[PDB]
Design a protein around this ligand. Sequence first.
Ligand SMILES: *[C@@H]1O[C@H](CO)[C@@H](O[C@@H]2O[C@H](CO)[C@@H](O[C@@H]3O[C@H](CO[C@H]4O[C@H](CO[C@H]5O[C@H](CO)[C@@H](O)[C@H](O)[C@@H]5O)[C@@H](O)[C@H](O[C@H]5O[C@H](CO)[C@@H](O)[C@H](O)[C@@H]5O)[C@@H]4O)[C@@H](O)[C@H](O[C@H]4O[C@H](CO)[C@@H](O)[C@H](O)[C@@H]4O[C@H]4O[C@H](CO)[C@@H](O)[C@H](O)[C@@H]4O)[C@@H]3O)[C@H](O)[C@H]2NC(C)=O)[C@H](O)[C@H]1NC(C)=O
Ligand SMILES: *[C@@H]1O[C@H](CO)[C@@H](O[C@@H]2O[C@H](CO)[C@@H](O[C@@H]3O[C@H](CO[C@H]4O[C@H](CO)[C@@H](O)[C@H](O)[C@@H]4O)[C@@H](O)[C@H](O[C@H]4O[C@H](CO)[C@@H](O)[C@H](O)[C@@H]4O)[C@@H]3O)[C@H](O)[C@H]2NC(C)=O)[C@H](O)[C@H]1NC(C)=O
Ligand SMILES: CCOC(=O)c1ncn2c1CN(C)C(=O)c1cc(F)ccc1-2
Ligand SMILES: *[C@@H]1O[C@H](CO)[C@@H](O)[C@H](O)[C@H]1NC(C)=O
Ligand SMILES: *[C@@H]1O[C@H](CO)[C@@H](O)[C@H](O)[C@H]1NC(C)=O
Lengths: 116, 106, 196, 107, 107, 231
Amino acid sequence: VQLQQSGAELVKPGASVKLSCTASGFNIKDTYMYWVKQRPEQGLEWIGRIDPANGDTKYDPKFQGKATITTDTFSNTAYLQLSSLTSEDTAVYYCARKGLRWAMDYWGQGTSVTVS
Amino acid sequence: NIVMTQSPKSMSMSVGERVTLSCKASEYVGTYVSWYQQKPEQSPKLLIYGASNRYTGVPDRFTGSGSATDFTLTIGSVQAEDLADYHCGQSYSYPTFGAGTKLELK
Amino acid sequence: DNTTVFTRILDRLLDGYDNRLRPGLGERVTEVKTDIFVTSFGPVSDHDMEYTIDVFFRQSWKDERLKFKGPMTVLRLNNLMASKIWTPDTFFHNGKKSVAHNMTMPNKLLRITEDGTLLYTMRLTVRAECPMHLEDFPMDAHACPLKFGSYAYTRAEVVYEWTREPARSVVVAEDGSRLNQYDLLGQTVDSGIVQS
Amino acid sequence: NMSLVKETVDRLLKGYDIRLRPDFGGPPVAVGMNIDIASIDMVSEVNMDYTLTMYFQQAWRDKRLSYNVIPLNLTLDNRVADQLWVPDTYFLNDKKSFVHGVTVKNR
Amino acid sequence: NMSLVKETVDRLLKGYDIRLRPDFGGPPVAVGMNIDIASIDMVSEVNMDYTLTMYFQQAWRDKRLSYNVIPLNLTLDNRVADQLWVPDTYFLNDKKSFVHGVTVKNR
Amino acid sequence: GDVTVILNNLLEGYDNKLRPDIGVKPTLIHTDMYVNSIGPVNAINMEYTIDIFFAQTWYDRRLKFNSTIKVLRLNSNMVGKIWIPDTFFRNSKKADAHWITTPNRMLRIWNDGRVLYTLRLTIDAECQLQLHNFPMDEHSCPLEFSSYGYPREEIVYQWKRSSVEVGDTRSWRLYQFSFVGLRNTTEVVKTTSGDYVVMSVYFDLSRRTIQTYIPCTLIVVLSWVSFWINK
Ligand SMILES: *[C@@H]1O[C@H](CO)[C@@H](O[C@@H]2O[C@H](CO)[C@@H](O[C@@H]3O[C@H](CO[C@H]4O[C@H](CO[C@H]5O[C@H](CO)[C@@H](O)[C@H](O)[C@@H]5O)[C@@H](O)[C@H](O[C@H]5O[C@H](CO)[C@@H](O)[C@H](O)[C@@H]5O)[C@@H]4O)[C@@H](O)[C@H](O[C@H]4O[C@H](CO)[C@@H](O)[C@H](O)[C@@H]4O[C@H]4O[C@H](CO)[C@@H](O)[C@H](O)[C@@H]4O)[C@@H]3O)[C@H](O)[C@H]2NC(C)=O)[C@H](O)[C@H]1NC(C)=O
Ligand SMILES: *[C@@H]1O[C@H](CO)[C@@H](O[C@@H]2O[C@H](CO)[C@@H](O[C@@H]3O[C@H](CO[C@H]4O[C@H](CO)[C@@H](O)[C@H](O)[C@@H]4O)[C@@H](O)[C@H](O[C@H]4O[C@H](CO)[C@@H](O)[C@H](O)[C@@H]4O)[C@@H]3O)[C@H](O)[C@H]2NC(C)=O)[C@H](O)[C@H]1NC(C)=O
Ligand SMILES: CCOC(=O)c1ncn2c1CN(C)C(=O)c1cc(F)ccc1-2
Ligand SMILES: *[C@@H]1O[C@H](CO)[C@@H](O)[C@H](O)[C@H]1NC(C)=O
Ligand SMILES: *[C@@H]1O[C@H](CO)[C@@H](O)[C@H](O)[C@H]1NC(C)=O
């Protein structure tokens, strides 16, 4: 149902930042978790996918190695870690759930990360 | 990777007129194409999952229809608050998203 | 007594459990996750317009009445208990004569996790049929389908979804395929709705 | 709800005598049959027989299986048909015929 | 004596829970197989299959079926196979297989 | 009235899994079969069909009722309860018993043990076929049966006085061969489990293409009539 994320993040290049979306109203071990990033006024783009039960994670080859997705099943939270940040990485990040034919029925609020 | 092509890029229509959108898919995607509605400075919602299926809580003026590659989102009686960005997204494979269509009233 | 604990846990789990009622009969709908692993794409026969297949059919649904608390957190149960709990029926719309194997015992494993998530795989050999268009013979290309759906359950009660990403669900073995004339090319998946 | 249905089914199928067809003393029971044909495989003049595969359906009215608590249409698992009554209908001209058993019996 | 063996078997098969393999929590069980091919009937190139008839044996160690009263080699009837545990073992490639039923199920 | 009492007394405190006399000298099963017909014999498949009426007898100390009723017949509904010896045909390829109306089985319990158990069968056996002896060829088709789970120390077979019969030899449907002789032998065979007493009954047969090669040579020789015709 409701998905909660963290607040805004402002960080200088060369530092790791950790974003988190905390699920609520449903058990995370049922469905996958997605991560979509959106620059200002562009098409949505896929970052990675995590499966809380097994642990398998697959990433977009253009982002593979840059971002690592881990989950804490007991606290019911999905974590996104960014590394090797550059100036052009400034964009909004979204947390997503799978449901009803792989359609991303619920979306988070959206976290704004600015690198400079 | 699968690439989605969307047209028209940006068009404007009057109030209460029929509106047709299209999203072309290069590879095969059999009826696993969803349509998202992103209003300015909000979180994208869901309108159509699969094809010609309406997510709950959605007005009836939104209809879809699709095939192996062709897809079409046809709005009915366009209201006043139907100005936003519509994204065509497929999930046959690792999900990708279209360029996005921007809709403004006139 | 290593077994006295597990026998208690596994008798209490079946106490008052009515196998005739699918989970959530008036509550939210059930969702059966499916997968297929083709062992060998059998010999296509031109005369009968049929083709044989040998799949490791799998199913995974969430049943809340079976959850518990124990040390193992995964139960690798025998092939006998699979008939005492609910198991969704799934026939093949275009199957002429399918057979389930019981080589030395029925080939059905049941894995009840701690949350309540099940896995219930089988082994099948299916003589499905497919219509052929021989107008381009011998240079023709066929598309022989395999359509497995629920039975006795409408769309409002049981809904199938592929376990993994639909492109990667139907997996085929590397050396398992055997064909004299034809040559397997690729797999394609698609979900629909059929009214009867 | 889930608790009502269990006790309802339990009290229906308790004391239900399978050997006696409904309305045993009085009028006959109306069994209405409906057929949906899927395919007619082959026609062989050597043996003078044709093979068909059909979805055979038949619905009758039975007062003993009546409940007034739940408005839903109970859909039971196919194991329960061994306990209810079922009108026996045979095909006067058949040589071999079998109910498919792909994953479970198809009824 | 008869009654000694009778009560020994009766106490072996009392409380035996078939759903659990031996040592359900601990280390795995060692199952040793032993095949005795009787005869290979036919080998075809059209269907690419070959039929063989064999004697299939296999022996494991089950700590629950232990007795120290009678020194004999207890050989029960073939019905007890339904009540004891037996490891499932399927053949990865077999189009049709069965167990001969001449006068009783041969096991 | 009283027969129900006798049966309920016999079945109380009776254990099915254990053969009679488990701790002492082994049971001695007598065997006697009656051949009804011999199916078609073919040389290609190297097999043949037979239809017999297998019948075997063994004492049993637990069925020792005492009453005025000398003998009680029983329908086949009783076979499942009392002990029944496993006996398979080593030479069988595909064997099936008959249940045309009901299970075809018989059971007769005399006064002091001595169960009788007979049942119909239909067997397909591999017959070692040799053809060089022709015109003096004499094929022998074996049929050898033995226990499956019991060593020599726990079960022993033995034939009766005659123990083999035949009937209606004219209507045995076999064409290329002809029934001649019949013999019986007993052996001991060692296998993985131990030693099994292997009964064996095998009876001989004699033989009585050439009708098809003639039309080909005839046309060959007849085509030559062209040559001596004038050019
Ligand atoms: C893998 O799966 C398949 C199918 O899923 C398994 O096949 C099934 O195997 C089981 C286990 O043995 C069989 O159950 C038993 O079958 C025997 C013999 O079956 C004969 O008759 C069959 C029909 O059964 C009867 O009922 C119908 C009803 O109309 C009547 O018409 C008949 O006349 C029969 O009376 C028939 O289908 C069989 O043919 C097939 O099987 C043989 C043998 O394998 C093949 O050679 C054939 O080619 C053909 O394929 C066969 O002719 C029955 O006798 C059993 O019933 C008695 O025994 C039980 C246990 O002892 C007992 O609980 C029952 O109550 C009943 O006992 C009654 O009778 C006793 C005397 O005999 C009494 O003492 C007792 O008091 C009681 O009154 C039982 O039914 C299935 O039939 C069989 N199904 C099929 C389709 O083949 C296969 O075995 C599995 N593999 C493995 C490794 O497990
Ligand atoms: C010809 O057509 C007839 C038409 O019915 C078929 O008859 C059916 O045959 C099947 C199998 O032979 C019968 O199924 C058996 O039912 C028994 C009765 O169930 C009792 O026990 C349960 C236990 O929970 C009670 O709930 C219930 O109320 C009954 O009191 C079962 O005991 C049998 O179980 C055995 O097999 C199952 C299979 O998984 C095992 O799990 C068990 O442990 C046990 O070994 C069995 O399920 C069915 O009852 C018959 N119908 C009728 C109306 O009697 C014939 O089978 C068919 N012939 C052929 C060859 O197919
Ligand atoms: C030699 C042992 O013989 C049997 O074991 C036997 N068992 C059953 N029957 C026989 C006898 N026999 C050769 C028959 O044909 C027959 C004919 C009947 F009308 C009724 C029963 C039998
Ligand atoms: C149950 O089936 C009947 C038959 O048509 C239908 O009228 C009724 O609406 C169904 N019940 C529900 C709750 O839909
Ligand atoms: C019982 O079986 C064991 C298995 O090896 C064997 O060593 C032993 O000799 C058998 N008993 C007798 C009395 O032969």
